[PDB]
Amino acid sequence: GRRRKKVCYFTANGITHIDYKDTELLKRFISERGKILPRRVTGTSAKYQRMLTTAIKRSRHMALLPYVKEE
Amino acid sequence: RRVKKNIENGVAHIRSTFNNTIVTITDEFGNALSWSSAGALGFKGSKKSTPFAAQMASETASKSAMEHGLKTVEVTVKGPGPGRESAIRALQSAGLEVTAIRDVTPVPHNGCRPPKRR
Amino acid sequence: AISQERKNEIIKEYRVHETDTGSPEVQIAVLTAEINAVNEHLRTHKKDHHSRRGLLKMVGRRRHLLNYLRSKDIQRYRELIKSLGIRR
Amino acid sequence: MRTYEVMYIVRPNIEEDAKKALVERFNGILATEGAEVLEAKDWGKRRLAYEINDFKDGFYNIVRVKSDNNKATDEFQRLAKISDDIIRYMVIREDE
Amino acid sequence: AIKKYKPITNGRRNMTSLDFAEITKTTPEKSLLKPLPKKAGRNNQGKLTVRHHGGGHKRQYRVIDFKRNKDGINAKVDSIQYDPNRSANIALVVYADGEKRYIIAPKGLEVGQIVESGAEADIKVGNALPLQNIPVGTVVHNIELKPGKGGQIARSAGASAQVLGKEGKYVLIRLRSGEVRMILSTCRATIGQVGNLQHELVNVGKAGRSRWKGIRPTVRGSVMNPNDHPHGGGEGRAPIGRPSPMSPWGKPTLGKKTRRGKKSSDKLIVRGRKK
RNA sequence: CUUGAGUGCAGAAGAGGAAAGUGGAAUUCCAUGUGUAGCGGUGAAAUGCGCAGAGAUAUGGAGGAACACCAGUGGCGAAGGCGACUUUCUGGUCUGUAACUGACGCUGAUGUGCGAAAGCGUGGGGAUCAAACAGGAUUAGAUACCCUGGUAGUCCACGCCGUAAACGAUGAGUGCUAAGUGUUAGGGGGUUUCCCGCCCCUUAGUGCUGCAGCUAACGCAUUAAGCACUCCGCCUGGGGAGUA
Numbered sequence: 037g038r039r040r041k042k043v044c045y046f047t048a049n050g051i052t053h054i055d056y057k058d059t060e061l062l063k064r065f066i067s068e069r070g071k072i073l074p075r076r077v078t079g080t081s082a083k084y085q086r087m088l089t090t091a092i093k094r095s096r097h098m099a100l101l102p103y104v105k106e107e
Numbered sequence: 108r109r110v111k112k113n114i115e116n117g118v119a120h121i122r123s124t125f126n127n128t129i130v131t132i133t134d135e136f137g138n139a140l141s142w143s144s145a146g147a148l149g150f151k152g153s154k155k156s157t158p159f160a161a162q163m164a165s166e167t168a169s170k171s172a173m174e175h176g177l178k179t180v181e182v183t184v185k186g187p188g189p190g191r192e193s194a195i196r197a198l199q200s201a202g203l204e205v206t207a208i209r210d211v212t213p214v215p216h217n218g219c220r221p222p223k224r225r
Numbered sequence: 226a227i228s229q230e231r232k233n234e235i236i237k238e239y240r241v242h243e244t245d246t247g248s249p250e251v252q253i254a255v256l257t258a259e260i261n262a263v264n265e266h267l268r269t270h271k272k273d274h275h276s277r278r279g280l281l282k283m284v285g286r287r288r289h290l291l292n293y294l295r296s297k298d299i300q301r302y303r304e305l306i307k308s309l310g311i312r313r
Numbered sequence: 314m315r316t317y318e319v320m321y322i323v324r325p326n327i328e329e330d331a332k333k334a335l336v337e338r339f340n341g342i343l344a345t346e347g348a349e350v351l352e353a354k355d356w357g358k359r360r361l362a363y364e365i366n367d368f369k370d371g372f373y374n375i376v377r378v379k380s381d382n383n384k385a386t387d388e389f390q391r392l393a394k395i396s397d398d399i400i401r402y403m404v405i406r407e408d409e
Numbered sequence: 410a411i412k413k414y415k416p417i418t419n420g421r422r423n424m425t426s427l428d429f430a431e432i433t434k435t436t437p438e439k440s441l442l443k444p445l446p447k448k449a450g451r452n453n454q455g456k457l458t459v460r461h462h463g464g465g466h467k468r469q470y471r472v473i474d475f476k477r478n479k480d481g482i483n484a485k486v487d488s489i490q491y492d493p494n495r496s497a498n499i500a501l502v503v504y505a506d507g508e509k510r511y512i513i514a515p516k517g518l519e520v521g522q523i524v525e526s527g528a529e530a531d532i533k534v535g536n537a538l539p540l541q542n543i544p545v546g547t548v549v550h551n552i553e554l555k556p557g558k559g560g561q562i563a564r565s566a567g568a569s570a571q572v573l574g575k576e577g578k579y580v581l582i583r584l585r586s587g588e589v590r591m592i593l594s595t596c597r598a599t600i601g602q603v604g605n606l607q608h609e610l611v612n613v614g615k616a617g618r619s620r621w622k623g624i625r626p627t628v629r630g631s632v633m634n635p636n637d638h639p640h641g642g643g644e645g646r647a648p649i650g651r652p653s654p655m656s657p658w659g660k661p662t663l664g665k666k667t668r669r670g671k672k673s674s675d676k677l678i679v680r681g682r683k684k
Numbered sequence: 685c686u687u688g689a690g691u692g693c694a695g696a697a698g699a700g701g702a703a704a705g706u707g708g709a710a711u712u713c714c715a716u717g718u719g720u721a722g723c724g725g726u727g728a729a730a731u732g733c734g735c736a737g738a739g740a741u742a743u744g745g746a747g748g749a750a751c752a753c754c755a756g757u758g759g760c761g762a763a764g765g766c767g768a769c770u771u772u773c774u775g776g777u778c779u780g781u782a783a784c785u786g787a788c789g790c791u792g793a794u795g796u797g798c799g800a801a802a803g804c805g806u807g808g809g810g811a812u813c814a815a816a817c818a819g820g821a822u823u824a825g826a827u828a829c830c831c832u833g834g835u836a837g838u839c840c841a842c843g844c845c846g847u848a849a850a851c852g853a854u855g856a857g858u859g860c861u862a863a864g865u866g867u868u869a870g871g872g873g874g875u876u877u878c879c880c881g882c883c884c885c886u887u888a889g890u891g892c893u894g895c896a897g898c899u900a901a902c903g904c905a906u907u908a909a910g911c912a913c914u915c916c917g918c919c920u921g922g923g924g925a926g927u928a
């Protein structure tokens with residue numbers, strides 16, 4: 037309760053964010069390949085997953101951030 | 108030219124199914140020059156599934172690849188299979204000068220139903 | 226939908242006195258407005274489940290509060306059916 | 314009455330003049346109907362993570378309108394996909 | 410919509426016909442009309458060339474401006490009307506200048522809606538303008554193949570073409586019939602599907618209702634005697650003996666191609682799908 | 685009369701629903717450039733595709749359907765169900781609050797309506813996947829598994845049927861009775877310079893281990909199969925038969 041990494045990463049984000057205007061919360065929460073870091077890795081709380089998810093997705097159709105970066 | 112595209116960096120693309128693996132060496136573009144098939148080299152079926160096929164095919168196209176002549180080459184990798192690791196090794200034995208390997212196992216986002224069976 | 230502005234307005238005329246917010250008169254009026262709005266949305270979109278469920282809760286409770294104001298009083302009852310023009 | 318942002322995206326290959334009359338026109342078509350062009354800016358040139366018609370690279374534009382929900386996107390969506398200069402676009406409400 | 414008729418007798422059971430909900434008046438403008446005798450499918454001579462026409466009901470010619478020639482000038486729409494000689498219902502158009510001209514009706518047209526004929530007339534339903542300017546991924550009716558004639562294309566009931574893309578000269582288009590053609594960049598056209606969509610769910614219902622139009626009967630070939638048609642003759646009923654089911658005039662029907670491959674537009678034709 | 689119920693006021697969240705709009709990968713079909721003799725498949729094979737240059741490789745085009753990570757015993761909803769994103773419309777829930785009406789409540793026969801997938805009509809669409817079917821192989825034989833193709837259909841819209849292991853095989857509602865432990869949205873307070881961090885408490889659903897007790901046993905154990913009340917539905921040996 038809980039065996040994941042630290043509780044309380046969120047101390048530097050909230051209440052509402054991003055939506056696209058902040059790279060400085062953006063790449064922290066994802067990979068280098070393009071996929072997302074799960075909640076096991078980052079140590080964030082649950083709703084922030086459920087926000088930053090849609091944050092990056094809105095960032096993708098505006099092409100601020102790739103669907104894929106393997107090259 | 109045109110059949111003899113001489114450069115010092117082209118591309119290699121690789122396949123490896125469970126039952127067959129094909130390799131090819133092309134340009135940066137690419138435009139295609141060589142290939143080899145485990146079945147082409149006499150093997151059949153159950154012996155296409157061998158790691159050694161990676162090697163003898165790797166050589167077997169690498170020769171004509173450096174007949175045109177080439178120093179370096181990139182390596183794409185598809186095909187979850189045995190030989191995706193081995194052909195790299197035996198391709199270094201040819202004496203060529205890979206700089207990077209890109210594993211692109213082509214994954215969809217559920218574009219179509221896969222075969223139910225089994 | 227409705228929005229608090231409309232709601233907080235119309236109660237002032239039908240509220241039996243000043244501070245009140247209950248006094249079921251209010252409630253059948255407000256619910257009346259709601260069901261009409263949702264009913265026209267519902268004719269726009271013929272097919273749904275959320276709505277008709279929602280209505281029939283509202284209408285169902287409307288009938289009840291009405292059956293309550295049929296016996297706590299009789300004058301308010303007639304007065305409100307002919308004021309709002311609902312429930313023949 | 315509710316708070317919309319909007320982003321719109323334009324190619325680089327146009328001449329800078331067309332960008333001017335386009336933008337001013339465009340804040341026009343968000344303005345004309347009673348709904349308020351409030352705070353217009355330009356995040357500007359930037360490279361994309363991937364190409365969208367064929368362009369690696371392109372322009373961005375940010376503006377803002379607070380309005381009723383009946384005046385701005387109803388016109389902009391119509392005048393978005395037909396226009397061969399506005400590439401992509403997306404509109405939201407006040408959430409992050 | 411189509412209103413089924415309650416069966417009361419034999420000759421109504423499968424019957425069906427239209428509701429006429431897109432109509433405002435019934436009697437037309439006298440002026441634009443123009444008279445029309447009939448021919449019953451036959452020549453300047455008098456001989457029958459096309460079979461089974463004539464027998465029908467009387468009618469007239471409602472004129473149309475398919476050109477949409479006068480450009481720029483905004484218009485309005487103050488009425489609909491009915492048109493026998495085409496499936497597509499028809500609109501009347503008070504131009505700005507007091508002129509009056511009839512136009513085929515796009516689906517979803519509002520009386521009082523306004524519609525233009527110009528280059529700078531930005532896209533809506535109804536507006537008339539060339540192909541070069543239109544965006545890709547749009548449905549369009551009443552294209553001209555040639556500058557200034559009067560359109561020949563998608564002019565019937567229901568939906569219409571698709572623009573797949575364009576060069577500078579010429580311009581592509583996919584039809585219904587799904588088939589492709591290169592079209593000029595400057596031919597005048599418009600946008601929006603055509604009106605009446607359920608003209609085809611009409612179960613005509615009874616024999617007369619072909620005569621009312623009118624058309625008239627067509628007799629089969631395996632019934633006649635063998636002069637008049639090749640299949641004919643035969644004791645009792647008549648399997649078609651020969652292969653290659655024939656017209657009365659030889660010349661098969663069933664699979665044979667009759668496009669003449671020397672025609673000039675055969676380069677413009679690509680990707681023949683329906684024929 | 686206010687404690688049940690409902691209305692408020694300030695708030696929290698959500699894959700709750702209907703319609704429209706947008707986008708990337710991927711499969712496929714075709715076109716073009718590159719280039720030769722195999723591809724693909726199996727446990728082993730064969731049938732098929734291919735010198736008309738396949739497959740492989742690169743570019744760009746069309747086209748339908750589904751939406752990698754995220755996703756978790758997580759959430760929502762009355763159930764069936766709902767996972768790309770954005771807008772429009774819109775249903776209910778939980779907390780705190782307590783002014784506000786002052787028992788308006790619970791259950792619910794007959795009726796009325798929503799209801800997986802398959803199925804049916806009418807009309808559109810047709811990329812995969814794939815009943816029926818054909819061929820191959822195995823096999824004593826195989827109209828079955830395996831393999832290569834492959835239509836309806838899957839898909840959309842308006843209608844219709846109206847069922848399931850529709851399952852937790854546990855009716856709804858209220859109330860009382862040991863703890864521990866995680867989790868989800870909230871609320872009060874102490875510590876902290878600031879809790880955002882730590883701790884203690886309290887509501888609502890959510891999972892596991894567990895006593896009292898029950899149960900024939902397995903097991904349930906504040907999300908009862910315990911202690912009781914109300915209301916409804918249902919069973920009276922098995923086959924015959926969910927048949928006539």
Ligand SMILES: [Mg+2]
Pocket residue numbers: none
């Ligand atoms: Mg609890």
